[PDB]
Design an enzyme around this catalytic site. Structure first.
Site, PDB file in Angstrom:
ATOM      1  N   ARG A 176       0.822  -1.206   0.000  1.00 18.14           N
ATOM      2  CA  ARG A 176       0.000   0.000   0.000  1.00 18.14           C
ATOM      3  C   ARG A 176       0.858   1.258   0.000  1.00 18.14           C
ATOM      4  O   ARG A 176       0.689   2.139  -0.849  1.00 18.14           O
ATOM      5  CB  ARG A 176      -0.932  -0.013   1.211  1.00 18.14           C
ATOM      6  CG  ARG A 176      -1.908   1.147   1.271  1.00 18.14           C
ATOM      7  CD  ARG A 176      -3.067   0.824   2.198  1.00 18.14           C
ATOM      8  NE  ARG A 176      -4.019   1.923   2.294  1.00 18.14           N
ATOM      9  CZ  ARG A 176      -4.887   2.076   3.285  1.00 18.14           C
ATOM     10  NH1 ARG A 176      -4.952   1.212   4.284  1.00 18.14           N
ATOM     11  NH2 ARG A 176      -5.710   3.120   3.272  1.00 18.14           N
ATOM     12  N   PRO A 184      -7.341  10.223  13.387  1.00 15.90           N
ATOM     13  CA  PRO A 184      -7.790  11.525  12.872  1.00 15.90           C
ATOM     14  C   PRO A 184      -9.183  11.457  12.271  1.00 15.90           C
ATOM     15  O   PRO A 184      -9.374  10.918  11.176  1.00 15.90           O
ATOM     16  CB  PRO A 184      -6.738  11.869  11.807  1.00 15.90           C
ATOM     17  CG  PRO A 184      -5.584  10.950  12.065  1.00 15.90           C
ATOM     18  CD  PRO A 184      -6.167   9.713  12.660  1.00 15.90           C
ATOM     19  N   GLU A 226      -8.295  17.665   8.758  1.00 17.32           N
ATOM     20  CA  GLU A 226      -9.580  17.634   9.447  1.00 17.32           C
ATOM     21  C   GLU A 226     -10.331  18.949   9.285  1.00 17.32           C
ATOM     22  O   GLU A 226     -11.563  18.959   9.190  1.00 17.32           O
ATOM     23  CB  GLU A 226      -9.368  17.299  10.921  1.00 17.32           C
ATOM     24  CG  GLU A 226      -8.768  15.925  11.128  1.00 17.32           C
ATOM     25  CD  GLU A 226      -7.698  15.908  12.193  1.00 17.32           C
ATOM     26  OE1 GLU A 226      -6.778  15.075  12.076  1.00 17.32           O
ATOM     27  OE2 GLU A 226      -7.762  16.731  13.128  1.00 17.32           O
ATOM     28  N   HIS A 272     -11.900  18.678   5.941  1.00 15.28           N
ATOM     29  CA  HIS A 272     -13.131  17.908   6.088  1.00 15.28           C
ATOM     30  C   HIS A 272     -14.234  18.765   6.696  1.00 15.28           C
ATOM     31  O   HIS A 272     -15.382  18.743   6.239  1.00 15.28           O
ATOM     32  CB  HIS A 272     -12.879  16.672   6.952  1.00 15.28           C
ATOM     33  CG  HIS A 272     -12.289  15.516   6.209  1.00 15.28           C
ATOM     34  ND1 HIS A 272     -12.955  14.866   5.193  1.00 15.28           N
ATOM     35  CD2 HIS A 272     -11.100  14.883   6.346  1.00 15.28           C
ATOM     36  CE1 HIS A 272     -12.198  13.886   4.731  1.00 15.28           C
ATOM     37  NE2 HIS A 272     -11.066  13.876   5.413  1.00 15.28           N
ATOM     38  N   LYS A 309      -0.849  -9.109 -10.569  1.00 17.62           N
ATOM     39  CA  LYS A 309      -0.004  -8.241  -9.753  1.00 17.62           C
ATOM     40  C   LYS A 309       1.407  -8.142 -10.321  1.00 17.62           C
ATOM     41  O   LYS A 309       2.031  -7.076 -10.278  1.00 17.62           O
ATOM     42  CB  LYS A 309       0.038  -8.756  -8.313  1.00 17.62           C
ATOM     43  CG  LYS A 309      -1.161  -8.371  -7.462  1.00 17.62           C
ATOM     44  CD  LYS A 309      -0.840  -7.211  -6.544  1.00 17.62           C
ATOM     45  CE  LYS A 309      -0.195  -7.686  -5.254  1.00 17.62           C
ATOM     46  NZ  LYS A 309      -0.091  -6.596  -4.247  1.00 17.62           N
ATOM     47  N   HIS A 327     -10.375  -2.451   3.976  1.00 14.37           N
ATOM     48  CA  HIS A 327     -11.522  -1.906   3.255  1.00 14.37           C
ATOM     49  C   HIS A 327     -12.305  -2.993   2.529  1.00 14.37           C
ATOM     50  O   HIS A 327     -13.541  -2.992   2.547  1.00 14.37           O
ATOM     51  CB  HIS A 327     -11.057  -0.833   2.272  1.00 14.37           C
ATOM     52  CG  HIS A 327     -10.224   0.240   2.900  1.00 14.37           C
ATOM     53  ND1 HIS A 327      -8.869   0.101   3.114  1.00 14.37           N
ATOM     54  CD2 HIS A 327     -10.554   1.469   3.365  1.00 14.37           C
ATOM     55  CE1 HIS A 327      -8.400   1.198   3.682  1.00 14.37           C
ATOM     56  NE2 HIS A 327      -9.402   2.044   3.844  1.00 14.37           N
ATOM     57  N   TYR A 372      -9.794   5.955  -2.935  1.00 11.46           N
ATOM     58  CA  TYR A 372      -8.414   6.419  -2.832  1.00 11.46           C
ATOM     59  C   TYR A 372      -7.893   6.922  -4.173  1.00 11.46           C
ATOM     60  O   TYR A 372      -7.211   7.950  -4.239  1.00 11.46           O
ATOM     61  CB  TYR A 372      -7.529   5.300  -2.284  1.00 11.46           C
ATOM     62  CG  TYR A 372      -7.769   5.016  -0.819  1.00 11.46           C
ATOM     63  CD1 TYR A 372      -7.079   5.713   0.165  1.00 11.46           C
ATOM     64  CD2 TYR A 372      -8.697   4.064  -0.418  1.00 11.46           C
ATOM     65  CE1 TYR A 372      -7.298   5.461   1.506  1.00 11.46           C
ATOM     66  CE2 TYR A 372      -8.925   3.807   0.920  1.00 11.46           C
ATOM     67  CZ  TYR A 372      -8.222   4.508   1.877  1.00 11.46           C
ATOM     68  OH  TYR A 372      -8.445   4.255   3.211  1.00 11.46           O
TER      69      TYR A 372
END
Lengths: 99, 652
Positions: free
Chosen positions: B311, B384, B413, B416, B519, B543, B553
């Site tokens: 990731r 967060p 934040e 957001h 992959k 997820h 994402y």
């Protein structure tokens, strides 16, 4: 949350000036009569407003007073009289003592 | 001249009084429901269509009244659930847990009642775009379209997969009693420790005790979601998730679910030359650290990408740093020297938000939300999170410290929150982001803007004597590429893999044979050890195992690059895109708020078009952001092999 304060969310029609609507007749959006109870398309005319300090400025509680200064045949009373005009002695003046 | 419209009772009266009616005076007959126009020496009947009965409230109006009443009740109920959620996250107690059960059941029951009460309202005859969008966002039955047993089974399986992933525990063969979880056990070990055997074992052990356990659960989860999608007129569950990006009813802005896939494919192809050079450089640096474990011609091990799933490659920065002697962009000395605090960090973020033209922030946030650690007598979530509790309530729950990261998360934040305050004018159903990649993008660009050296210099975080050299810029570009560009193929391949596995294009006895081979080819990530079909490696992520669409994402990164470039264009900044700052730019704040207030009231295409200038998701900002990186990446990989060999594997 403060829930002892209500606001008229629904009403039969528009409000006339200086009118207080206290009637709690169930709002009937649909054609099915409410008959004193809430069912299909039947909502209370008054919605319970919740007051919280966490709410935003636009949604914060605001104590608002509207005043209607109406002049009628009766003599006008509500005002702040000028008064002032500190009394002056030993001088020719144009006095006015309450008429 | 001018004339009015006449009206009498009987036609006999009309005849007796039409003598004095001047020409041009319309005569309407209540008894006959007829209309006449007074012409010279007569009256001509005006043709009237079929009688239209008076509607007390049209079907469109009935939906409008229902939606307004639902939204009014939803604001109070959601606020009660949100405040109960805040109490549980501030302090975790038995009383806090049980009010989640009450609030969750009450909210779900209320949503189900309104959704059923909305399902009879037809969306075809309603031409109000806002009303139609509200109804379709309220009529989403989801898992309730199936039978009670099927819906309950799907929910139980989903809880099982989340529980297995959360409680997945691996024990070392040396000490079977000694066992560790994925977080913070396996994640930190595979992000800091450089031992190949330890990382390989944790990668294999986790995917064994989770993949084998989740393989029947995920398979049954996939088929149940697929059959639910079929019952919802969706080709697969991936189509159901792409329905959020789906736009209908607006001319010049309609977006289909298949358009999202093709844009993701096109964008990944554009990033492919940049990611290939980035992967080649990271691959080359791993030989500089481990010359006898990986081959430059082949791919890179999944467990050696800084994590298990590949990731984030940020953990590989120490292994892939171009110049380790050059200090990174860090202003931690300013924090300790000036005694900076989390509340001061948020205050500076608000002041910076004021500088960019956006208005102030409510004081209810400061009197109701915590920023630092709330002591130790209670347990509070330090993740967060930004809170939109509704009816004007906006909070943030996280154990914010005084780190550059925290300063970025605070901005994140705030970003957001700014979105939450912006679409607040829109109705409750429309009081959210247009898609799942908008709210996160605003926070990301805010973090990116707050991380620029110019912004730190303006507010004093960065010393004025600090110099900007090529090595620092190159390292920062590489760090951003590993963190953001590095996860783009991971999001691309995982969401793609979930798409055709939901479409049923992957036979069961070949699942891992496709994922692990794909992959190696599209992305060049190779499993260190072979995995058979009993493994469920793609579902080992949070997820995918928690019923979350992972396309967020990729979309949020595409949006965040477009927003940053558009803000830079509006801020008339001169210099590289990575050094671009939106400080003291009222144009950037005003342009951002133009789409922020829209939320999901308007289609996401309109929201995107508002700032960048188009509804497409082209990665031109990404190329421009990392063009100096790309040239440097090409310079580093001018002799190093570029690409990856599908055949090569660490176990082969």
């Amino acid at each position: 949350g403060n829930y002892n304060y209500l606001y008229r969310l629904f009403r039969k029609s528009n409000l006339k000036p200086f009118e207080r609507d206290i009637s709690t007749e169930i709002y009937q959006a649909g054609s099915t009569p409410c008959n004193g109870v809430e069912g299909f398309n039947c909502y209370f005319p008054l919605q319970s407003y919740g007051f919280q300090p966490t709410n935003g400025v636009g949604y914060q509680p605001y104590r608002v007073v509207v005043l209607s200064f109406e002049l009628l045949h009766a003599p006008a009373t509500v005002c702040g009289p000028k008064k002032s005009t500190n009394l002056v002695k030993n001088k020719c003046v144009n006095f006015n003592f309450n008429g | 001249g001018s004339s009015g419209v006449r009206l009498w009772a009987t036609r006999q009266a009309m005849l007796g009084q039409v003598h004095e009616v001047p020409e041009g005076w319309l005569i309407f007959v209540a008894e006959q429901e007829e209309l006449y126009v007074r012409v010279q020496n007569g009256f001509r009947k005006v043709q009237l269509e079929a009688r239209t009965p008076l509607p007390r409230s049209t079907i469109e109006e009935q939906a409008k009244t229902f939606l307004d009443k639902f939204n009014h009740e939803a604001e109070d109920l959601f606020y009660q659930s949100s405040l109960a959620s805040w109490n549980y996250n501030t302090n975790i107690t038995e009383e806090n847990v049980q009010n989640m059960n009450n609030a969750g059941d009450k909210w779900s029951a209320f949503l189900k009642e309104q959704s059923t009460l909305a399902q009879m309202y037809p969306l075809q005859e309603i031409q109000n775009l806002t009303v139609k969008l509200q109804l379709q966002a309220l009529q989403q039955n989801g898992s309730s379209v199936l039978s009670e047993d099927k819906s309950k089974r799907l929910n139980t399986i989903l809880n099982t997969m989340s529980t297995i992933y959360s409680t997945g525990k691996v024990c070392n063969p040396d000490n079977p009693q000694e066992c560790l979880l994925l977080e913070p056990g396996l994640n930190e070990i595979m992000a800091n420790s450089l031992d190949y055997n330890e990382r390989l074992w944790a990668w294999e052990s986790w995917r064994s005790e989770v993949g084998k356990q989740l393989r029947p659960l995920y398979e049954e989860y996939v088929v149940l979601k697929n059959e639910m999608a079929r019952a919802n007129h969706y080709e697969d569950y991936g189509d159901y998730w792409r329905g959020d990006y789906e736009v209908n009813g607006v001319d010049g802005y309609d977006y289909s679910r298949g358009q999202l896939i093709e844009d993701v494919e096109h964008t990944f192809e554009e990033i492919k030359p940049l990611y290939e050079h980035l992967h080649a450089y990271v691959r080359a640096k791993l030989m500089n650290a481990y010359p006898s474990y990986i081959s430059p011609i082949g791919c890179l091990p999944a467990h050696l990408l800084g994590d298990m799933w590949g990731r984030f490659w940020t953990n590989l920065y120490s292994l892939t740093v171009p110049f380790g002697q050059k200090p990174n962009i860090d202003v931690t000395d300013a924090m300790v020297d000036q005694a900076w605090d989390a509340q001061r960090i948020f205050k500076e973020a608000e002041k910076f938000f004021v500088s960019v033209g956006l208005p102030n922030m409510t004081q209810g946030f400061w009197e109701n939300s915590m920023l630092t650690d709330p002591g130790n007598v209670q347990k509070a979530v330090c993740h967060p999170t930004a809170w939109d509790l509704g009816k004007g309530d906006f909070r943030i729950l996280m154990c914010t410290k005084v780190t550059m990261d925290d300063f970025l998360t605070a901005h994140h934040e705030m970003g957001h929150i700014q979105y939450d305050m912006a679409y607040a004018a829109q109705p409750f159903l429309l009081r959210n982001g247009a898609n799942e990649g908008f709210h996160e993008a605003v926070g990301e660009i805010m973090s990116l803007s707050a991380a620029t050296p110019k912004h730190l210099k303006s507010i004093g975080l960065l010393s004025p004597d600090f110099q900007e050299d090529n090595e620092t810029e190159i390292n920062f570009l590489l760090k951003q590429a590993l963190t953001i560009v590095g996860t783009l193929p991971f999001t691309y391949m995982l969401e793609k893999w979930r798409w055709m596995v939901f479409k049923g294009e992957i036979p069961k006895d070949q699942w891992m044979k496709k994922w692990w081979e794909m992959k190696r080819e599209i992305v060049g990530v190779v499993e260190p050890v072979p995995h058979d079909e009993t493994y469920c490696d793609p579902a080992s992520l949070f997820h995918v195992s928690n019923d979350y669409s992972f396309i967020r994402y990729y979309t949020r990164t595409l949006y965040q690059f477009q927003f940053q470039e558009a803000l830079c264009q509006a801020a008339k900044h001169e210099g590289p895109l990575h050094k671009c700052d939106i400080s003291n730019s009222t144009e950037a704040g005003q342009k951002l708020f133009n789409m922020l207030r829209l939320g999901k009231s308007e289609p996401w295409t309109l929201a995107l078009e508002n700032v960048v200038g188009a509804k497409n998701m082209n990665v031109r900002p990404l190329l421009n952001y990392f063009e100096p990186l790309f040239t440097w990446l090409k310079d580093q990989n001018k002799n190093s092999f570029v690409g990856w060999s599908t055949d090569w594997s660490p176990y082969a």
